[PDB]
């Protein structure tokens, strides 16, 4: 282990043609002890989905913090935040406390209702826009994911082919990740609706 | 009663608010007309001496490239408050939202600076009522009036200042539900020539628009994915052009 | 004489400044909540209007403070603006800390202190805002309250603030029904608003409307602000237009 | 008139601040202070009235020193003038630490004028009510100012204030006439005394004590010091001789 | 990463590669290393990607605020001094390395600024990981006085050598040309040294090639009365 | 990086090595270390390059105020600002700065301000890391109240030995001449001064 | 008389602001206390303003500060509302310190304490 | 403290707390609680470093109690747990960090459902039917899957909990010298005497 | 009736009586200033009225050196004159080290003007009674004159004048610019632009001037200096001689 990611967790975001997906494992760990099988990494505010990897206490704290920040916006402008705009909001929350900083790697996923265009982003510890629209992965299996994703990646798969491609990438990676191995939930996100599908997979 | 910011009146309201309103009425005449692809904003300049440079007065000041303003009321209050407005717009809403703020949101910040200058007694509120027009990709072209009473209202066409009352009926009569920007620019000059005559000319009337994106003003190129300034200030020579064809 | 600052009382144990602050309220338009077990309607009237005042792009006398509690405003809109921001910020603070959308009581009680606080301490002006708080909390169901500018609260089955408080209250309690319908509650608000307001025809554009319901699809709480056209249609039904 | 005093920041319609004019009137009741600038120095003399004949003589001064080279004498209220010199010693001292040199006389003139101006600008303090004549010698030679309670200052060839300003400005006006050249600091010591002696016919009810001080580039090594002993007695004999 | 600047007569060019590495893994293959301070000031980032990104934004808002305030064109010169101050305050606890250059009425200027707050002027600069690999190309091939043409050719050559010898410098070259009294020309992906190699099988398969356990709809919108 | 300033009869001439090194990497090879803080007052910088720049700009804020309110500053006056700053920022900053200037009434005056910050009036001074290689040649070969040609030749030659014996010293030898004629720049290039 | 302000004393030695404060108490609902020997009963008038007033959610005139001390009020309802909350933070805090529940004798001092404080000062009304 | 467990069954929540209080090489007292009521149907056990434990328990106790009086209505266990998580996650960025880890059991009387929430020191809320911190969780988590069923009576949960005490005792050097077993039900919170 | 015993409390016309009594305090030293634009200079010539003979004249001034390229001429009273001069100097200093370049005539005048607004915004300071006029040749605007008023109103100018007899100065200037049909003086060295300002002022007032009775400040390109009495004297016989 490392001090910024003792409690693990993995999130993977891809782009398809006018669709995104995002998926995560559901294992929480604390050192070598696997604690809970149900505990989601990904949370959402309106129509933008966010996974937050890292030291587990800060995932929970920013889940709450972002909800407070998003909802202040929504009520005031009378309209949903968009996943282009939402990028720079993560970047400022993370940078406010550069000294003593949040230990997370959040990954956005989402599709605009003003372009119909998939937007994914990654951020580090004190935050950055990593504005690739290749595919964006974070977590303890960061190394593992960048290769598995790359191999499979063909741009502009149909949504239901995209579900095959991200679920497979995630499952292989997880078996070989020490601090995640249990459960999975995959979000297949479209403009119209958002379908959530839990996998069935091995436990360790 | 009338005569502290602290004292409520028998029928209510603060009087300092009413007196600050009086100040506006001693002002110059500014007016805005919403078209379906723009907002035109217009005002005049005066300075007493003709030995004065007129291109040094600030009264058409862009807050952001997306959002222009005018005032009626105190000249000093304008420069200070434009300065403050800009400063707040980047802190609350360009470091966070990541782009220059919405027309609705920015109008609320401006009202909030006023409001703080009413709460603290012995500190007068600003002498100005501004008109703040802008564009955003959600609520479209928009127009507001933000009063020194710290409240703002959205409007279709409006005028403020001394000549307001004469201008508003011209606006009722001459506004139609579908207009172009070019018919709005001519209606704007026409109405503003009621405010004064004997001195109205293309170098002393300052008129600007918040119309369509202009990449001409963007100043960097080869980036198609962003838009250019909505704002455009028309030069003295343009204002003369429009005044001849009228 | 005693019409000064807030520390000082009148020898009759009246603070003139709370009394005047009440009177501020009836110089901004009528605002009515009527509670029903099917839902709460909040209905409001515009203080004044012109033919080129835009009022179909936004509300400005109906604000959501959160996703289950919303407020109608009557009084100075400047005084209102700061208090709505403070209420809304607190509404989400409660969300962050407990993982529940804030109870109606905790939110009214907070704001009652705040109004009281500006009168009691320092040299600051009291507030001259009446907010009709209409909420849902899973304790008491449906809830109506209203708060005085004085900085206290009472729960209601119907209340009217804003201009023409006495008459608007009288017509409401005259035709009120204990169980009511949501649909009837909307009708009784137009019927009253007609006779109290000195506008010749009662137009959709002089109305804002929002409804808070759990009976428009259960399992969930739905806040439905009426758009201009929905308002425009319901006048027809009641035959004012 | 009535109104626009009772405050010390309130403008009058005439365009003035009344209360600030009433300051000058207090300075007029104060005892006579003069400075005669000289060609290689400055001489400050002051009329110190005798409250009763129980006063200790030459042990109470309205002369105070600032740093080690700048003379100050105030006319107006005695303690107000003290309070303003203490602030001045701290300011001269901060300048001195910061730059590792003694103050210029123009430097001090700027700084003092800001501290008087600060109390005319705010609503919770009474403006000062003292004039303070000061000066000394620097690189750039000798210089003399007189700072009014209004916070106004200019250089002077010669300056007078107090009850005796009527006599004193007139004697100084003869002094420039008889000497446009400068007048040596030595001969100005003997001069300083005569000026006070004639200015003491405006405070004739009481008796006085004459104290002379000086600061001269070549007869005091740039430093301020009290004039005493033989120099001080000669000036007395000079003033006594010509008054009769 | 690699960043160069080449001063020429009629302006200054700033080039930098698109790849961003955070550890031995590549964060992004394409992501901008030309951040916009003002319409006529541009700069590129090196070091820790987060520190450079934040700083540019922080200083950028201030120089747009300044333009409005001084009611005149944004100086490069304003920007550096303000930025330098900003950098000083952390005492080198912020890990930003930048090359800032621009055109203003004082002319074209090309500056280097370090994390410490050391500041330099040259007529050819570089900073980053791959700075030693580009620096060699500039000193040899540069001479004093150049046209537009030669400057743009020399700038892309330096990054290109950058990619081929430096590990953290990769992918494509993005170039921005700021000439005095003309528009900045943002030429995205001016140069590719090596295009993509494709994968040799199709990896898209039917569904049920990945196992499902439950299928659900999660909310994202408010229902009506239906 | 060796810097000097050396008085003579008609003035003082500052000398500086234009090489700036951060490790074995020369960060820049044509960045001079001559910084104007006033018309007749100039400063040489050695030590930590970041630290010295930051001190340097604040001395000018003071001396801007100094010119406007209090008449021109003297060579002495500016050198005191340096001493004050270095001393209070003992543990945050080590600045080796040589302050020198021309007055009319006093001629050229040289003050070295140490790392720790003091002030030391000297007829000739050398500071930095490149300055510990040229001491013995500076003492012997100098004479007071020189003629202008001779003073340049003294500065050029001392700094030429510095380059043989240190690696942080190099570039071109910069000089700023301060005399009553004005401020004059002078430069040499290595092709010339290694034949010495 | 000397009701123009709170801090100035009065020839008559009665601070007017306090006297008028009492007068205000008569506005509000009657409350009565009667002690037994094994009971205290604390009753209050609960005056009904209209028939539209809830009994569902509308506040009672009697408020428990802690789990064995009870409190009624008479006065300005607005003012009572923060007085009851301030009473309560301390009250609970009493257990933080001692690990003893709130003693009635310590509690009266405290409630009199917040009040005394407001009177002593000049930039608050009682 | 030296043993802390939580098992949640059909209609109750069961929590076990260490008796022993180990301070240096001496056990100063062999029969002390390490649990305090938050509410009449919400019970928080605590374990961790000494001194942190005692002042923290009482401080949290004061706050939940104060809310309960304010609203004159008791907060749901779900609420309570998020409150206790928020204090820990703030402390980890503050001057004085805690090492107090908690399990909060509650018989939710609004959802009519038993709930156990494990909360660690750093500040992680997890809903889980099991729970334990220290090196007590590293024995008894494994054990719990087999002998647990999808539900059982509170009596069968008591015996199940006794089995985890027996596992710990054998294989862990730490003494705790019996346990206090407190049950959290719909009718209050009670103590059952257990070996 | 309330409403100049307070800074902030408005009249029922929406005027601030107290703030306007500051526009009327600029007559208290009773001097006139003229500053005009040439084609490579900005000139300011204001009276130096040394009333008494007890005064040494060379310390009497209203022209202040603010910065390397910036002067300021004061009309109105001395105590506030000095406060205006330190703040503009203090700000000149701040701008250079913060933003790393010289300070233009606009940037300074706007900042002082905003500052005047702040002083009227609070009721914790007063307005000053001084009129400030900044003179410079700007780095890319060339000749610039910005008048900063006591409220905080500013407008630029081709020519401005200030003082009691300002109206008499104003007609003479207007007629010149009307007839010439340029916004400048086309004299191509500053020594004759200075002569031109002296020329108009003699005619307006009807008074001769002498060495002690004028003060002249000259903003030239990239430098600034205020002229001694003997250099002013050279100018004065240049007028007399044609």
Curated annotation (Swiss-Prot), chain B:
Domain of life: Eukaryota
Chief location: cytoplasm
UniProt GO cellular component terms: nucleus; proteasome complex; proteasome core complex, alpha-subunit complex; proteasome storage granule
Annotated GO biological process: proteasomal ubiquitin-independent protein catabolic process; proteasome-mediated ubiquitin-dependent protein catabolic process
Chain residue numbers at which the record places covalent cross-link Glycyl lysine isopeptide (Lys-Gly) (interchain with G-Cter in ubiquitin): 104
A family per Pfam: Proteasome_A_N
Location of the protein in the cell: Cytoplasm; Nucleus
Record key words, sorted: Cytoplasm, Isopeptide bond, Nucleus, Proteasome, Ubl conjugation
Keyword Ribosomal protein applies: no
CDD domains, A to Z: proteasome_alpha_type_2 (cd03750)
Other observations noted: Present with 7060 molecules/cell in log phase SD medium.
PANTHER family recorded: PROTEASOME SUBUNIT ALPHA/BETA
Function: The proteasome degrades poly-ubiquitinated proteins in the cytoplasm and in the nucleus. It is essential for the regulated turnover of proteins and for the removal of misfolded proteins. The proteasome is a multicatalytic proteinase complex that is characterized by its ability to cleave peptides with Arg, Phe, Tyr, Leu, and Glu adjacent to the leaving group at neutral or slightly basic pH. It has an ATP-dependent proteolytic activity.
Family listed: Belongs to the peptidase T1A family.
Record-given protein name: Proteasome subunit alpha type-2
Native organism: Saccharomyces cerevisiae (strain ATCC 204508 / S288c)
UniProtKB/Swiss-Prot annotation, chain C:
Chief location category: cytoplasm
Cell compartment(s), UniProt: Cytoplasm; Nucleus
Sorted UniProt keywords: Cytoplasm, Isopeptide bond, Nucleus, Proteasome, Ubl conjugation
Cellular component terms per the entry's GO annotation: cytosol; nucleus; proteasome complex; proteasome core complex, alpha-subunit complex; proteasome storage granule
GO biological process, any: proteasome core complex assembly
One Pfam family recorded for the sequence: Proteasome
Domain of life where this protein originates: Eukaryota
CDD domains associated with the record: proteasome_alpha_type_4
Cross-link type Glycyl lysine isopeptide (Lys-Gly) (interchain with G-Cter in ubiquitin), residue numbers: 96, 195, 227
InterPro entries: Ntn_hydrolases_N, Proteasome_alpha, Proteasome_alpha-type, Proteasome_asu_N, Proteasome_bsu_CS, Proteasome_sua/b
Similarity section: Belongs to the peptidase T1A family.
Function text: The proteasome degrades poly-ubiquitinated proteins in the cytoplasm and in the nucleus. It is essential for the regulated turnover of proteins and for the removal of misfolded proteins. The proteasome is a multicatalytic proteinase complex that is characterized by its ability to cleave peptides with Arg, Phe, Tyr, Leu, and Glu adjacent to the leaving group at neutral or slightly basic pH. It has an ATP-dependent proteolytic activity.
Further comment found in the protein's record: Present with 17100 molecules/cell in log phase SD medium.
Protein name: Proteasome subunit alpha type-3
Originating organism: Saccharomyces cerevisiae (strain ATCC 204508 / S288c) (Baker's yeast)
Gene it is expressed from: PRE9
Curated annotation (Swiss-Prot), chain D:
Major subcellular site: cytoplasm
GO cellular component terms, semicolon-separated: nucleus; proteasome complex; proteasome core complex, alpha-subunit complex; proteasome storage granule
Biological process according to GO: proteasomal ubiquitin-independent protein catabolic process; proteasome-mediated ubiquitin-dependent protein catabolic process
Keyword annotations: Acetylation, Cytoplasm, Nucleus, Proteasome
GO molecular function, one term: mRNA binding
Known partners and oligomeric status: The 26S proteasome consists of a 20S proteasome core and two 19S regulatory subunits. The 20S proteasome core is composed of 28 subunits that are arranged in four stacked rings, resulting in a barrel-shaped structure. The two end rings are each formed by seven alpha subunits, and the two central rings are each formed by seven beta subunits. The catalytic chamber with the active sites is on the inside of the barrel.
Family: Belongs to the peptidase T1A family.
Name of the protein described by the UniProt record: Probable proteasome subunit alpha type-7
UniProt gene name: PRE10
Included range, full protein: 5 to 248 of 288
From Swiss-Prot, chain I:
Cited function: The proteasome degrades poly-ubiquitinated proteins in the cytoplasm and in the nucleus. It is essential for the regulated turnover of proteins and for the removal of misfolded proteins. The proteasome is a multicatalytic proteinase complex that is characterized by its ability to cleave peptides with Arg, Phe, Tyr, Leu, and Glu adjacent to the leaving group at neutral or slightly basic pH. It has an ATP-dependent proteolytic activity.
Family classification: Belongs to the peptidase T1A family.
Record text on subunit structure and interactions: The 26S proteasome consists of a 20S proteasome core and two 19S regulatory subunits. The 20S proteasome core is composed of 28 subunits that are arranged in four stacked rings, resulting in a barrel-shaped structure. The two end rings are each formed by seven alpha subunits, and the two central rings are each formed by seven beta subunits. The catalytic chamber with the active sites is on the inside of the barrel. Interacts with CIC1.
GO cellular component: mitochondrion; nucleus; proteasome complex; proteasome core complex, alpha-subunit complex
Source organism superkingdom: Eukaryota
Misc. comment: Present with 15200 molecules/cell in log phase SD medium.
Cross-link (Glycyl lysine isopeptide (Lys-Gly) (interchain with G-Cter in ubiquitin)): 223
Pfam families linked to this entry: Proteasome (PF00227), Proteasome_A_N (PF10584)
Main location: cytoplasm
Modified residues (Phosphoserine): 228
Taxonomy of the source species: Eukaryota, Fungi, Dikarya, Ascomycota, Saccharomycotina
Keyword flag Nucleus: yes
Cell compartments where the protein resides: Cytoplasm; Nucleus
Name of the protein in question: Proteasome subunit alpha type-1
């Amino acid at each position: 282990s490392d001090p910024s990611s003792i409690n693990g967790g993995i999130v993977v975001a891809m782009t398809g043609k006018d669709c995104v997906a995002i998926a995560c494992d559901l294992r929480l760990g604390s050192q070598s002890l696997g604690v809970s099988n149900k505990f989601e990494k990904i949370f959402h505010y309106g129509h933008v989905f966010l996974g937050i990897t890292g030291l587990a206490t800060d995932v929970t704290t920013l889940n709450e913090m972002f909800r407070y920040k998003t909802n202040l916006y929504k009520l005031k402008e009378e309209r949903a935040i968009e996943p282009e705009t939402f990028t720079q909001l993560v970047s400022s929350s993370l940078y406010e406390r550069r000294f003593g900083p949040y230990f997370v790697g959040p990954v956005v996923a989402g599709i605009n209702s003003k372009s119909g265009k998939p937007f994914i982003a990654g951020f580090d510890l004190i935050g950055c826009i990593d504005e690739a629209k290749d595919f964006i992965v974070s977590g303890t299996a960061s190394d593992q994911l960048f290769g598995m994703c790359e191999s499979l990646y063909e741009p502009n798969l149909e949504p239901e082919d995209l579900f095959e491609t991200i679920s497979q990438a995630l499952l292989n990676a997880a078996d070989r990740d020490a601090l995640s191995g249990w459960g999975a939930v995959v979000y297949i996100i479209k403009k119209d609706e958002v379908v959530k599908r839990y996998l069935k997979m091995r436990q360790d | 009663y009338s005569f502290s910011l602290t004292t409520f009146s028998p029928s209510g309201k603060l009087g300092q608010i009413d007196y600050a309103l009086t100040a506006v009425k001693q002002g110059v005449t500014s007016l805005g007309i919403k078209a379906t692809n723009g907002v035109v904003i217009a005002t005049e300049k005066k300075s007493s001496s003709p030995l004065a440079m007129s291109e040094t007065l600030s009264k058409v000041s862009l807050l952001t490239p997306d959002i222009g303003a005018v005032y009626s009321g105190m000249g000093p209050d304008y420069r200070v408050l434009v300065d403050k407005s800009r400063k707040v717009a980047h802190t609350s809403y360009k470091r966070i939202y990541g782009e220059y703020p919405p027309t609705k949101l920015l109008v609320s910040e401006v009202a909030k600076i006023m409001q703080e200058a009413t709460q603290s007694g012995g500190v007068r509120p600003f002498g100005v009522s501004l008109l703040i027009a802008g564009h955003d990709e959600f609520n479209g072209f928009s127009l507001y009036q933000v009063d020194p009473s710290g409240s703002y209202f959205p409007w279709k066409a409006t005028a403020i200042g001394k000549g307001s009352v004469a201008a508003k009926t011209f606006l009722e009569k001459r506004w139609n539900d579908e207009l172009e920007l070019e018919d709005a620019i001519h209606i704007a000059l026409l109405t503003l020539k009621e405010s004064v005559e004997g001195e109205f000319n293309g170098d002393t009337i300052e008129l600007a628009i918040i119309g369509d994106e202009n990449p001409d003003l963007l100043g960097y190129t080869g980036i198609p994915t962003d838009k250019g300034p909505r704002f455009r200030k028309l030069t003295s020579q343009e204002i003369n052009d429009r005044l001849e064809a009228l | 004489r005693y019409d000064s600052r807030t520390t000082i009382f009148s020898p009759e144990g009246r603070l003139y400044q709370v009394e005047y602050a009440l009177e501020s309220i009836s110089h901004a338009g009528t605002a009515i909540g009527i509670m029903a077990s099917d839902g709460i309607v909040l209905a409001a009237e515009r203080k004044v209007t012109s033919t080129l005042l835009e009022q179909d792009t936004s509300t400005e006398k109906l604000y959501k403070l959160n996703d289950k509690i919303a407020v109608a405003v009557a009084g100075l809109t400047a005084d209102a603006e700061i208090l709505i921001n403070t209420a809304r910020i607190h509404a989400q603070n409660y969300l962050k800390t407990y993982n529940e959308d804030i109870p109606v009581e905790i939110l009214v009680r907070r704001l009652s202190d705040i109004k009281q606080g500006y009168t009691q301490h320092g040299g600051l002006r009291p507030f001259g805002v009446s907010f009709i708080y209409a909420g849902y909390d899973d304790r008491y169901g449906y809830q109506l309250y209203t708060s005085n500018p004085s900085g206290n609260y009472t729960g209601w089955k119907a209340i009217s603030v804003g201009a023409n408080t006495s008459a608007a209250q009288t017509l409401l309690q005259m035709d009120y029904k204990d169980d009511m319908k949501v649909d009837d509650a909307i009708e009784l608000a137009l019927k009253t608003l007609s006779k109290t307001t000195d506008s010749s025809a009662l137009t959709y554009d002089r109305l804002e409307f929002a409804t808070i319901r759990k009976g428009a699809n259960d399992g969930e709480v739905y806040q439905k602000i009426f758009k201009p056209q929905e308002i425009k249609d319901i006048l027809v039904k009641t035959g004012i237009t | 008139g009535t109104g626009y005093d009772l405050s010390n920041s309130v403008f009058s319609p005439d365009g003035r601040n009344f209360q600030v004019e009433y300051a000058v009137k207090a300075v007029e009741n104060g005892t006579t202070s003069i400075g005669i600038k000289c060609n290689d120095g400055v001489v400050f003399a002051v009329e110190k009235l005798i409250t009763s004949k129980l006063l200790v003589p030459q042990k109470n001064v309205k002369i105070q020193v600032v740093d080690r080279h700048i003379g100050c004498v105030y006319s107006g209220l005695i303690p107000d003038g003290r309070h303003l010199v203490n602030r001045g010693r701290e300011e001269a001292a901060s300048f001195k630490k910061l730059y590792k040199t003694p103050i210029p006389i123009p430097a001090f003139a700027d700084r003092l004028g800001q501290y008087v101006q600060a109390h005319t600008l705010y609503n919770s303090v009474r403006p000062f009510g003292v004039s303070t004549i000061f000066g000394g010698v620097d690189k750039n030679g000798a210089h003399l100012y007189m700072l009014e309670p209004s916070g106004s200052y200019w250089g002077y060839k010669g300056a007078a204030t107090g009850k005796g300003r009527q006599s004193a400005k007139a004697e100084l006006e003869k002094l420039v006439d008889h000497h446009p050249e400068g007048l040596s600091a030595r001969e100005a010591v003997k001069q300083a005394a005569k000026i006070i002696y004639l200015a003491h016919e405006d405070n004739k009810e009481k008796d006085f004590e004459l104290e002379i001080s000086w600061c001269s580039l070549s007869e005091t090594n740039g430093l301020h010091k009290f004039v005493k002993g033989d120099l001080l007695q000669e000036a007395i004999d000079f003033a006594q001789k010509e008054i009769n | 990463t690699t960043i160069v600047g080449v001063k020429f007569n009629n302006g200054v060019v700033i080039a930098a590669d698109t790849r961003s590495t955070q550890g031995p893994i590549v964060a992004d293959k394409n992501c901008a290393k030309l951040h916009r301070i003002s319409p006529k000031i541009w700069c590129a980032g090196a070091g820790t990607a987060a520190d450079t990104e934040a700083v540019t934004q922080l200083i950028g808002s201030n120089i747009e605020l300044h333009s409005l305030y001084t009611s005149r064109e944004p100086r490069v010169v304003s920007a550096l001094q303000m930025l330098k101050q900003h950098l000083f305050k952390y005492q080198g606890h912020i890990g930003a390395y930048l090359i800032v250059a621009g055109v203003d009425p004082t002319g074209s200027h090309l500056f280097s600024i370090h994390a410490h707050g050391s500041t330099d002027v040259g007529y050819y600069l570089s900073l980053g990981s791959g700075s030693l690999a580009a620096m060699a190309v500039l000193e040899s091939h540069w001479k004093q006085d150049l046209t537009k043409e030669e400057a743009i050719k020399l700038a892309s050559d330096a990054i290109q050598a950058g990619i081929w010898n430096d590990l953290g410098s990769g992918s494509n070259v993005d170039v921005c040309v700021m000439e005095i009294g003309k528009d900045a020309e943002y030429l995205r992906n001016y140069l590719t040294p090596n295009v993509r190699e494709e994968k040799q099988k199709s990896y898209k398969f039917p569904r049920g090639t990945t196992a499902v356990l439950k299928e659900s709809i999660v909310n994202i919108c408010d229902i009506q009365e239906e | 990086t060796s810097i000097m300033a050396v008085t003579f009869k008609d003035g003082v001439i500052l000398g500086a090595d234009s090489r700036t090194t951060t490790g074995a990497y020369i960060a820049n090879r044509v960045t001079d270390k001559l910084t104007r803080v006033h018309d007749k007052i100039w400063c040489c910088r050695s030590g930590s390059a970041a630290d010295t720049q930051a001190i340097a700009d604040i001395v000018q804020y003071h001396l801007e105020l100094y010119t406007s309110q209090y008449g021109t500053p003297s060579t002495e006056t500016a050198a005191s600002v340096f001493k004050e700053l270095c001393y209070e920022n003992k543990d945050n900053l080590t600045a080796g700065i040589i302050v020198a200037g021309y007055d009319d009434k006093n001629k050229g005056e040289v003050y070295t301000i140490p790392l720790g910050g003091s002030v030391h009036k000297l007829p000739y001074a050398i500071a930095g890391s490149g300055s510990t290689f040229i001491y013995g040649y500076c003492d012997k070969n100098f004479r007071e109240n020189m003629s202008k040609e001779e003073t340049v030749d003294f500065i050029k030659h001392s700094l030429s030995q510095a380059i043989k014996w240190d690696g942080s010293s190099g570039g071109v030898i910069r000089m700023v001449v301060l005399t009553a004629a004005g401020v004059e720049r002078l430069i040499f290039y290595p092709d010339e001064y290694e034949q010495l | 008389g000397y009701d123009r302000a709170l801090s100035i004393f009065s020839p008559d030695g009665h601070i007017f602001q306090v006297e008028y404060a009492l007068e205000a108490v008569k506005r509000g609902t009657c409350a009565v206390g009667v002690k037994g020997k094994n009971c205290v009963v604390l009753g209050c008038e609960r005056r009904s303003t209209l028939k539209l007033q809830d009994t569902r959610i509308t506040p009672s005139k009697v408020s428990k500060i802690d789990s064995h001390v009870v409190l009624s009020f008479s006065g300005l309802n607005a003012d009572s509302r923060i007085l009851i909350e301030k009473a309560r933070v301390e009250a609970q805090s009493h257990r933080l310190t001692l690990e003893d529940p709130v003693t009635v004798e310590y509690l009266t001092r405290y409630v009199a304490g917040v009040q005394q404080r407001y009177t002593q000062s000049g930039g608050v009304r009682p | 403290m030296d043993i802390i467990l939580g098992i949640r069954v059909q209609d109750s929540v069961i929590l076990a707390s260490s008796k022993a209080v180990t301070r240096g090489i001496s056990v100063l007292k062999d029969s002390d609680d390490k649990t305090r009521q938050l509410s009449p149907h919400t019970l928080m056990s605590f374990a961790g470093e000494a001194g942190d434990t005692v002042q923290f328990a009482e401080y949290i106790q004061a706050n939940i109690q104060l809310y309960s009086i304010r609203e004159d209505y008791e907060l749901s266990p779900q609420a309570v747990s998020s409150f206790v998580r928020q204090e820990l996650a703030k402390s980890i960025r503050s001057r004085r960090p805690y090492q107090v880890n908690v399990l909060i059991g509650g018989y939710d009387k609004k959802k009519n459902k038993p709930e156990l929430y494990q909360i660690d020191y750093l500040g992680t809320k997890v809903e889980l039917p099991y729970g334990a911190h220290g090196y007590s969780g590293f024995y008894t988590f494994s054990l719990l899957d087999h002998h647990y069923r999808p539900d059982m009576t509170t009596e069968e949960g008591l015996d199940l909990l006794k089995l985890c005490v027996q596992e710990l005792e054998k294989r862990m050097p730490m003494d705790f010298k019996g346990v206090i077993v407190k049950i959290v039900d719909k009718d209050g919170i009670r103590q059952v005497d257990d070996f | 009736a309330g409403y100049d015993r307070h800074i902030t409390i408005f009249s029922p016309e929406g005027r601030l009586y107290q703030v306007e009594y500051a526009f009327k305090a600029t007559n208290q030293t009773n001097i006139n200033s003229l500053a005009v634009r040439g084609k490579d200079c900005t000139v300011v010539i204001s009276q130096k009225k040394v009333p008494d003979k007890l005064l040494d004249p060379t310390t009497v001034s209203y022209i202040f050196c603010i910065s390397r390229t910036i002067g300021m001429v004061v009309n109105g009273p001395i105590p506030d004159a000095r406060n205006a001069a330190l703040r503009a100097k203090a700000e000149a200093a701040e701008f250079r080290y913060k933003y790393g370049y010289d300070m233009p005539c606009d940037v300074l005048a706007k900042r002082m003007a905003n500052l005047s607004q702040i002083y009227t915004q609070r009721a914790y300071m007063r307005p000053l009674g001084v009129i400030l006029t900044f003179v410079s040749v700007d780095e890319e605007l060339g000749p610039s004159i910005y008048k900063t008023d006591p409220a905080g109103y500013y407008v630029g100018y081709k020519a401005t004048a200030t003082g009691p007899k300002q109206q008499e100065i104003t007609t003479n200037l207007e007629n010149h610019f009307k007839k010439s049909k340029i916004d400048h003086i086309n004299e191509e060295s500053w020594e004759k632009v200075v002569e031109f300002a002296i020329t108009h002022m003699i005619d307006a007032l009807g008074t001769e001037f002498s060495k002690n009775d004028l003060e002249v400040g000259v903003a030239t390109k990239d430098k600034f200096f205020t002229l001694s009495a003997e250099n002013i004297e050279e100018r004065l016989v240049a007028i007399a001689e044609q």
